[PDB]
């Protein structure tokens, strides 16, 4: 019997041939405020090692891991969730070719239903009378509706971490699919989003007027003390020292995002090319740090995006580079110690996604900046509504405006830059992970 | 000094090495409906022949061809009009990569302004006091505002033959560009679109309180007599005989569209493949006629689409074909004689674009059908609002729904198909080209 339950595809522990491997994060932090004698976290076995753990009865106290059939899991999680819903909500489809709702899609939708149902049955079995249930993200959007039918006594929350598709865009789904998805989520007493634009979009898709479901905005932020302590370890100090050597005495424009289609890395690079073309005074005087670390390697479009990032970076280096200067410093590692050092050094942060739910990098950088950092932020970034007073606004498709914002950011008077950096840090730490989580739990008392 | 003026990129005369030749067709028929002594049609020179005619001072009466500098023409017409605005209004952008509004875009936009201004200045010099000016299509969307400034007395109409972008999609343009485009259009006393959805989208983008612009819906139809006469020439009878032998004793699903990105040929082929998989009784009993004739060869995306259409048709032939049956008959030529024959033969017509202004094919087939034709029509087709009661409706992304409509179409009992065809033919001809255009001229009374 649990009185507080969480459901997410990914739980706190992963097992490998068995050894246990812990990932932290927002949910670990949030549940650490809840009595561990009263909570249960339901999650999925992510691969063979996790399924073996479940097979042997090996598992963490307060965690229930579900063995969902590998082909049903692939079709639900990689198929519908991470391809079809991810693309829908981020507006990423190449309209002449995708989406395609065919017989195979329908088969994969049936698995998505069955994947969600395994979670709903687990929660239904474990939850005390009137328990609070917090369902996390688009993977489990049918759970609230399924679980409402099994257990009308439960208090059910669901939080979407992505954007929500605009109503016109959402109507690409066949009507029966769209409608099943909306009913799935409308089973909740409370639906949460990071921003009111995402919340409004969901509300418009539902037709307005959904009186049993409270729609709310809980924008996730950062724990200042925790991030600062990590950023000031000697390993970061060391790596920062090496990074200053690599950059030289030059200014920095920093990003660290993986090559995900919504991140808008290419147009960012194009804006950098135009900056160096139009404002030649920056040649030998600035370096753009960017990542070409792959987001995904199992879709053709994602592999082509990563390759285009690599190639465009190399074109810019060949055009403007000298023996002493590399204009784009490309990282292909995923090393958080290096990112923290990049955050500490940054003169300019380039956070220009087409659309996103909440990129925390916009919040993380100002919190750890050693001497101030100007933020170039797109209107589609989830952090936009909270940070727009002290960031330089850019419209994500507008490369010329993005190039000009880089110039304004690079020339921002140092005391203005500090005042902005301090106000950005304040807004960024308003709702750390633990209070973000507790507000959702509190919302289920409403 | 003329009292009725028409403006379009393409005029009614083409010069070939010199001989004036008049290609005609439905829309040129319409725009010519007010050729008189007191009228003028301003258009651009399109080949070296046209350019020679202008340089020499050779022209047909009532026609003024403009020699626009070749680089301004390329950037304005191929670039901004046929690439930027075409993609915008049909929603064809691949969001992770395009659109990109950079320095080169800005330079092409300046050419688009100058190209529109060449037309505006010609019209200004040639129009009598309070003359009616009918400007045609998205190429010339700035002319009304430009001309309005030069000549406040003129009565100006503008007709858009494409869709209009939804307000959210239209806001991808930089705000100064979007606002200039809208002010360009709003110079007019009347703005015309083929459908209410398109007019409504423009009205929503324009917002505001524009008291001197009325927005009207004039859907272009077909002249039955001109079309039937062309469809029953001996050359069509002869090509139709051959086509029956190519097909054999089998049903036909017909389309003739070039490989343009909005046409949705790939999803149509996937629906055909699904039809033959789910209703396999149709093997050896139907042939799908489709075209792989190129729409364009100067954009990478258009070359890729043509290659995909070719490849997919070949996969379907390899998958289901036998010595005596080839399921997809691919045409790689552009012969209107063959197309009229296929119109007359068609059991099913497949008109499933993602979005279009008015494709007349949906109207032409029922007009000339020898024995009845079942029309499968997408909700995004321009003809949808007029033809939906007797067409089988499909949603353009729903390949299963499109495959099921193909089955319903092929199994339709002949007398139901006949009644539907007659009603379609009636709807198709309610507003033929000459009246369509005369109503616009009458619209400029007041």
Numbering used by the authors:
A (entry chain A), B (entry chain C): 1 to 17, 23 to 451
Task: Give verbatim lines from the article.
The only route for the de novo biosynthesis of trehalose in S. venezuelae is via trehalose 6-phosphate. OtsA (α,α-trehalose-phosphate synthase) is responsible for the formation of this metabolic intermediate from an NDP-glucose donor and glucose 6-phosphate as the acceptor. In all cases, trehalose 6-phosphate is dephosphorylated by OtsB (EC 3.1.3.12, trehalose-6-phosphate phosphohydrolase) to give trehalose.
Crystals diffracted to 1.95 Å, allowing the protein structure to be solved using molecular replacement. Four copies of the S. venezuelae OtsA protein were present in the asymmetric unit. Consistent with the size observed in solution, the biological unit appeared to be a dimer. The fold comprised twin Rossman-like β/α/β domains in a GT-B configuration. A molecule of MES buffer is bound in a cleft between the two domains of S. venezuelae OtsA in what is likely to be the active site, by analogy with the E. coli enzyme. Attempts to obtain a structure of the S. venezuelae enzyme with either GDP or GDP-glucose bound were unsuccessful. By contrast, the equivalent residues that define the donor base specificity of VldE, which uses GDP-valienol, are similar in S. venezuelae OtsA. Our structure of S. venezuelae OtsA most closely resembles the open conformations despite not having any ligands bound.
